[PDB]
Structure 1
Amino acid sequence: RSIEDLPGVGPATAEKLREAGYDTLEAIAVASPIELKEVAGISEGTALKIIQAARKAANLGTFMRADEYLKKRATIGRISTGSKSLDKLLGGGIETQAITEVFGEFGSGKTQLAHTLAVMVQLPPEEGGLNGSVIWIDTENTFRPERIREIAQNRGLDPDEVLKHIYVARAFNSNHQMLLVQQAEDKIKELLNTDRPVKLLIVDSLTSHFRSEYIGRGALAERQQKLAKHLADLHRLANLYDIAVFVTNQVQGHILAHSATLRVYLRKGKGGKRIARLIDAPHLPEGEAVFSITEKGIED
């Protein structure tokens, strides 16, 4: 069992389960009969069979032998940010099979960094990419394919071509946002086993909608639960398909991606240049990196 190829589930059922967030084997794997019965209509007893099927079928519910795990890590790709400086700081660039969160004040250039990465990932490994496609979930209406065109035609790249390996979706609110993730897996497997599989998945902004729809100390609790799951939905895709997940988080309520594989903080610096810094010591250096915004996106 891979997707909803579970025993008691037909498409109609799968329909109700998806529109409700139970889109993965693990999602169902961790549910209760009552919940599924009330979400799909199925009886308490078949729902139970469904759950068990999922618990047993779950992909991310199985342990991997460390020799196997050591190898998985051996196959981790790295996208360049387009800045020697920053890459040093990342030890090569943002990695696949990981969620990299970049956060800072409005205008700290994290959306630029997103655009750059959407180009880099497209060029060859030696060039700083992984010859891959891009899935972009836009929540603040900040994706400018025009900036893509630019940055592309400024690194000797055929903009008309680069624009052909980026797929966007506008997320109008939290539920939409979360929902588009599952539909991202659709396109990911579609472009999977292609000359250019998906290697970069951007969520900009990742927190925007959550910190606007959940205001209150009574809203805080489930705010976290939903983010927790959303993040889990991204982690899965990241590992299940060797994808690099890049998420932005405007800061300074308060929220963040606690389970982000790596959190990079960046702020406006000197004059027109931005300075990014890491938030921990384990795995990777411990200093600051300066760069600037220009054509080609991020430089230095």
Structure 2
Amino acid sequence: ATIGRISTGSKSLDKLLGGGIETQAITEVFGEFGSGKTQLAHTLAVMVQLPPEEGGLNGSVMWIDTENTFRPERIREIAQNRGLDPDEVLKHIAYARAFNSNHQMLLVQQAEDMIKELLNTDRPVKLLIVDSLTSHFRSEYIGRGALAERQQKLAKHLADLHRLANLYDIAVFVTNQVGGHILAHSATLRVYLRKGKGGKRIARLIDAEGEAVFSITEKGIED
């Protein structure tokens, strides 16, 4: 399948991204708390449900929380203040909370089952979000980060995500929080977010371009 794009709601960020976040890719956004990574995640979960003429892909969403950040009320606001029925939007976001790093790894294998069930419907999964993807991998191995187990599991977890992204034409969108944090360096595309002046958020590609600049609004994010 050809690559699909999901618009972020920000023309500036869409341009930095060549059109939007890609299917068949893992896109990692990372920064400090409040850098906009969680706001981007909620915004994409609505935008992907739009048709392509408005930057969506008519898709369903799966959301996996490590740290309780999903806010159905925020989904509702972004849907409402755009042209969308909030009931149909929340109904197409399947949610799960990863309890620990091992349950997290099972939830991805479980997600494949639902991906396959929806594959030949009119709302196939097109977005799979994992917020604070490495959180459990960090907090479970304090005092033993050199144990090869922590690296082996994370690497397998990311390879599972990369497989789902490519096999089923899905945009995988993962966030990580900022110095003991661990990031998804194997991501297809990595984006750094930070707070800027005047309440703005700034995005820069890692490539390891310019910068995009956007606001957190009632429509999620926009220029």
**CA distance 1:88–1:213, change in 2 (3 Å):** same
Shift of 1:132: 0.3
Contact 1:104 1:252 in 2 (8 A): no
Determine whether 1:298 maps to 2:221: yes
Shift of 1:221: 2.4
Contact 1:264 1:279 in 2 (8 A): yes
Cα distance in 2 for residues equivalent to 1:220 and 1:298 = 40
Structure 2 counterpart of 1:89: 16
Shift of 1:270: 1.0
SS at match of 2:106: helix
Shift of 1:218: 5.2
Shift of 1:156: 1.6
1:260-279 Cα shifts (integer Å, max 9, x gaps): 00000000111221001000
1:63-122 Cα shifts (integer Å, max 9, x gaps): xxxxxxxxxxx6110001110000100010110000000000111110110000000000
1:31-58 Cα shifts (integer Å, max 9, x gaps): xxxxxxxxxxxxxxxxxxxxxxxxxxxx
The one of 153, 164, 175 aligned to 1:226: 153
SS at match of 1:209: helix
Shift of 1:205: 1.3
Cα distance in 2 for residues equivalent to 1:165 and 1:101 = 22
Shift of 1:217: 4.4
Percentage identity across paired residues of the two chains = 98
Decide which structure has the larger Cα Rg and report it. Answer: 1
- The answer for unaligned runs of 5 or more in structure 2 is none
- The structure with the greater share of residues assigned to helix is 1
Which of 1 and 2 has higher RCO (CA within 8 Å, sep 6+)?
A: 2
Cα distance in 2 for residues equivalent to 1:159 and 1:136 = 17
SS at match of 1:86: helix
TM-score using structure 1 length: 0.72
Alignment of 1:213-292 (within 5 A): 213-217=140-144, 219-280=146-207, 286-292=209-215
**CA distance 1:271–1:240, change in 2 (3 Å):** same
**CA distance 1:220–1:190, change in 2 (3 Å):** same
Which deviates further from its counterpart, 109-118 or 155-164? 155-164
**CA distance 1:136–1:85, change in 2 (3 Å):** same
SS at match of 1:169: strand
**CA distance 1:102–1:277, change in 2 (3 Å):** same
Shift of 1:256: 1.3
Structure 1 counterpart of 2:62: 135
Contact 1:134 1:199 in 2 (8 A): yes
Contact 1:139 1:170 in 2 (8 A): yes
Shift of 1:254: 3.1
Shift of 1:219: 4.4
